[PDB]
Design a protein around this nucleic acid. Structure first.
Lengths: 83, 88
DNA sequence: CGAGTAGCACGTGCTACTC
DNA sequence: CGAGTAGCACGTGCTACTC
């Protein structure tokens, strides 16, 4: 009685994990529309997260530089005109 | 007999496979800020949160690209202004 | 031994694909 | 060739949490 029920609950639990793997797979560019085992999905997700965190960090790095540039230019435009 | 050897091989190879999969789960968990002090996070929570985190990083890139593009156009504008004003 | 059940991990089942 | 392997599904029993 409780045996068949427990078995159904466990199957349902595994199914949710299956759906979650699919949603994860859909999030990594290299796995989209591709075939991969669960081990590959976890491994590629991990490498992609490291890669992205170093990619955005570089993005912010280029942004702050432009930030320092525009601030200086703003200084010049200020101290310039029809003196 | 062979059937018994095959059974034992299956058990040992699958056990090892589980172990390696757990390794992969832990490695991924370690890359999610939100799971910093939650080493016991169940498999499904690691999946859902890794997914949430990835989506945030991508959207986060789309914002950074939009900002850099704006800062660049801004820079050339400032320079264009300097040229119009001339020196003192 | 309180009942219900999420999570886990083992042994085993299942089968497409390989050599 | 037809047996071996890969990789995911299943049944099950035990813990811990929550009511």
């Amino acid at each position: 009685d409780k045996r068949a029920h427990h078995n159904a609950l466990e199957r349902k639990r595994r199914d949710h994990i299956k759906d979650s793997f699919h949603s994860l797979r859909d999030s990594v560019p290299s796995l989209q529309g591709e075939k991969a085992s669960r081990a590959q999905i976890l491994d590629k997700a991990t490498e992609y997260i490291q890669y992205m965190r170093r990619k955005n960090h570089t993005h912010q790095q280029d942004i702050d530089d432009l930030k320092r540039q525009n601030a200086l230019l703003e200084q010049q435009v200020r101290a310039l005109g029809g003196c | 007999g062979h059937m018994n050897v095959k059974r034992r091989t299956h058990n040992v190879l699958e056990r090892q496979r589980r172990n390696e999969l757990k390794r992969s789960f832990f490695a991924l968990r370690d890359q999610i800020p939100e799971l910093e002090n939650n080493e016991k996070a169940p498999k499904v929570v690691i999946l859902k949160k890794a997914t949430a985190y990835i989506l945030s990083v991508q959207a986060e890139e789309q914002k950074l690209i939009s900002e850099e593009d704006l800062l660049r156009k801004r820079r050339e504008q400032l320079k264009h202004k300097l040229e119009q004003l001339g020196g003192c």
